[PDB]
Design a protein around this ligand. Structure first.
Ligand code: A1B29
Ligand code: ZN
Length: 139
């Protein structure tokens, strides 16, 4: 679990969105596993606007942060789960690292701010849904 709070927005994994996220929906994309809802309170997270390929992510199943090198956002084939059929997930970045069910929503950050959130795992890999292209989060 986990979300990004920026301005009057909350960014969560679409498969973990609550009834309240859907009732205050701003934007959602099943192909990215992202959903953004509006909030009454002001958020203070900073979103990176960069092309970093190194950063640090939070892994809740280890209560630890890990440094990682990650691939550029791309279309990656993801196996069927209870939330989605087998499909290509877009804007996904992979790194070698630990991630298991319950780790989605962990923030990946570089020196410029928030890069994305954990969205996939297994096999000694961890996948992050990129949010750096969502320039509207800052306006
Ligand atoms: N973005 C998606 O399509 C997600 C939806 C939830 C299920 N997905 C996983 O990757 C899960 C949880 C993250 S960790 C993990 C480790 C081993 C096997 C599977 C998983 C795919
Ligand atoms: Zn950066």
């Amino acid at each position: 679990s986990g979300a990004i709070y920026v301005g009057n927005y909350r960014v969560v994994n679409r498969h973990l969105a609550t009834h309240n996220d859907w009732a205050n929906l701003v934007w959602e994309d099943s192909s990215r596993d992202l959903l953004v809802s509006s909030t009454t309170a002001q958020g203070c997270d900073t979103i990176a606007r960069c092309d970093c390929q190194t950063g640090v992510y939070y892994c809740s199943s280890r209560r630890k942060h890990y440094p990682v090198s990650f691939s550029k956002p791309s279309l990656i084939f993801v196996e069927a789960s209870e939330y989605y059929p087998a499909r290509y997930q877009s804007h996904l970045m992979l790194a070698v690292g630990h991630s298991e069910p319950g780790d989605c929503g962990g923030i990946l950050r570089c020196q410029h701010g928030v890069v994305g959130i954990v969205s996939t795992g297994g096999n000694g890999l961890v996948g992050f849904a990129d949010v750096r292209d969502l320039l509207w989060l800052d306006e």
